[PDB]
Amino acid sequence: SGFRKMAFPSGKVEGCMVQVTCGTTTLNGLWLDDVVYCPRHVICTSEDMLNPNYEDLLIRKSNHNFLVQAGNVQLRVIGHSMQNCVLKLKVDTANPKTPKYKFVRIQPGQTFSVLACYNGSPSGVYQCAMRPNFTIKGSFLNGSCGSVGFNIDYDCVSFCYMHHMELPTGVHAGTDLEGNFYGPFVDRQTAQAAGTDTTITVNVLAWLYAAVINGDRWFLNRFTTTLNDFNLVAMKYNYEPLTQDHVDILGPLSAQTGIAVLDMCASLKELLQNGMNGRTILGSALLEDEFTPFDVVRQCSGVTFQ
Amino acid sequence: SGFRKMAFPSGKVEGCMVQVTCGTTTLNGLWLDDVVYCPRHVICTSEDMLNPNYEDLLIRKSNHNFLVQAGNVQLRVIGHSMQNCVLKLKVDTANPKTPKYKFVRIQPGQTFSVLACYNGSPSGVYQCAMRPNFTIKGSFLNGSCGSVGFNIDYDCVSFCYMHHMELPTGVHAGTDLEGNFYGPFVDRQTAQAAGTDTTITVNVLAWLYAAVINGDRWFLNRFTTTLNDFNLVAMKYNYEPLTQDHVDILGPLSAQTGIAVLDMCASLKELLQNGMNGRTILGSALLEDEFTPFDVVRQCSGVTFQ
Ligand SMILES: *[C@H](CC(=O)OC)[C@@H](C[C@@H]1CCNC1=O)NC(=O)[C@H](CC(C)C)NC(=O)OCc1ccccc1
Ligand SMILES: *[C@H](CC(=O)OC)[C@@H](C[C@@H]1CCNC1=O)NC(=O)[C@H](CC(C)C)NC(=O)OCc1ccccc1
């Protein structure tokens, strides 16, 4: 038993991380097939990033201005193109370690694993959730751009994130693998505001179902409620509105534990109106919202990957 | 910036995970060079595990009674030996993916990364700390034995843990890679008690230094204290006694933030005597003790691995 936040095995992604250098700027790149993906601001200096005209900046750059290093071996760049906020460097060698991969654009509330890299070398892996305001709360130092977020079905790597920015608030913003930013963010060193960060309600309920599975029981109360009544209290505490869909994905955990979703919603209702009273749930003194209803089943059914 | 609990890249360990079957029992094995390491209770049935005589049980087993599977390829076992609570299966093929590796026995309070596996296939990775009572709080379902814990310097994998048991309390116990259990535990399905779980004081102080680095400041107070005075209050809250050694490892974070260790100890002293008042530090409403003083520097200096 036991419940922890768990990142996917990063072995398949490690084989695709390369170092990309342009001028004096160095970041990480994603080498899939014969294409290297990296943030387009690799063509930017520190002064360029204040107000960059990426088109005018990319005009001055050629193929030989891009040094792609895979450990100690170099990839000869034979073409480059700017797709939105990402750069696609065509190399003359296909990556022999390319797994079966996809490019997906996740939805708010869904989670993924981040392989933090510097100089194209992995440093650590952790689980991140795309907040409803399309930010993430990760760990990114200088040189961490180009690092990717991903999910794995069994042998298929679903790339979904690439890191670009840290906002003035300390949270992080990025794009998908097509260069499109998550949220209303642009890759420019200027003050940028995300919306009000709300709580992924279906995720806290799934995390409460996991605690119920793992022996944490004190929170289980005796009330029930309705979908609109709970949403009136959920909107009071900046929680996402629970839809009939969210009830359907939680069905698996509800049908196994025998607690109706509206019953769990009532136990969550009192948990917001009365606090934790100095108690903990699964070793945390607050409500966790970074566990999707599929992340708990993944940890209770024991799925694997090859 | 930002601070998260981070697991090492598990790519090098994934290449050493194989499936080990004996009779009807299947668990994970560690394939390094031409030796496969796995818990010795692979020779046990469900009824054997109540009171096993491992010697008498291993007498009945031969080399061909051990099926070692690496994906779809089998490893021919040509020898077996019981070292403490671990089984060493000699195969006729050296693992071509063996990294530079060591076998170490960690100290209480130190952390490591756990690659959770089932049927020799990785499932997830998370960071664990060896509690002062020589247990860990992980996530282990049925079939998770043989999974290992490890640390990486740069290209050297330091294996330190192998999973065996879940206690009646829900926490987990295991051995090093030499078969010696951490703590007073034996691999037998019987009621077994760990001691009183105490808090790794040097780890909470290092985690407070990280919050100080990442903008979390409200806890910083104005008192100071002495080593004995703080230990009198630390022992009151079941905290490990802080030694002059612990002050020396915290020197790096103390000399960078400019807060003396005894000053941080006073801010921690009031944090125990006054609680958090419904506030959070680094997104947690309690004091984290699973971050060693080297784990914060690892996340603030940005070390990498190859
Ligand atoms: C990407 C550049 C890189 O890593 O390698 C060239 C980022 C820096 C990362 C983002 C998270 N922390 C970092 O150090 N460089 C940037 O200039 C971007 C903005 C756009 C050009 C994408 N991020 C940014 O300006 O972040 C502000 C910041 C806050 C705290 C610390 C460093 C930067
Ligand atoms: C190892 C066996 C295995 O995984 O594959 C053969 C363990 C089961 C693991 C330990 C953590 N959770 C599991 O399911 N089998 C055991 O019998 C051991 C005891 C010794 C023989 C090592 N663990 C044990 O008895 O755990 C009790 C338990 C609690 C909760 C759920 C399952 C088992």
Outline the biggest β-sheet of chain A: 7 strands, antiparallel
Helix- and strand-based class of chain A?
alpha+beta
CATH topology of the largest domain in chain A: Thrombin, subunit H
Oligomer: homodimer
Architecture (CATH level 2) name of the largest domain in chain A:
Beta Barrel
> Could you give the order of the helices and strands of chain A?
HEEEHEEEEEEEEEEHHHHHH
Please state the overall shape of chain A, judged from the principal axes of the Cα atoms: elongated
Give the count of structural domains of chain A: 3
Helicity of chain A, as a percent range: 10-25%
CATH class identity of the largest domain in chain A: Mainly Beta
Strand content of chain A: 25-35%
User: What is the total tally of β strands of chain A?
Assistant: 13
Fourth-level CATH superfamily of the largest domain in chain A: Trypsin-like serine proteases
Q: How many helices of chain A in DSSP terms? A: 8
If you compute it from the alpha carbons, what radius of gyration of chain A comes out, rounded to the nearest whole angstrom?
22 Å
Largest interface: A-B, 55 and 55 residues
Q: Give the distance, in angstroms, between the N- and C-terminal Cα atoms of chain A.
A: 23 Å
Q: Identify the bound ligands.
A: ligand VQR
Strand order of the largest sheet of chain A: 5-4-1-2-3-7-6
Subunit structure (chains A, B): 3CL-PRO exists as monomer and homodimer. Only the homodimer shows catalytic activity. Interacts with host FBXO22; this interaction promotes the proteasomal degradation of nsp5.
Domain Peptidase C30 (chains A, B): 1-306
Protein name (chains A, B): 3C-like proteinase nsp5
Subcellular location (chains A, B): Host cytoplasm; Host Golgi apparatus; Host nucleus
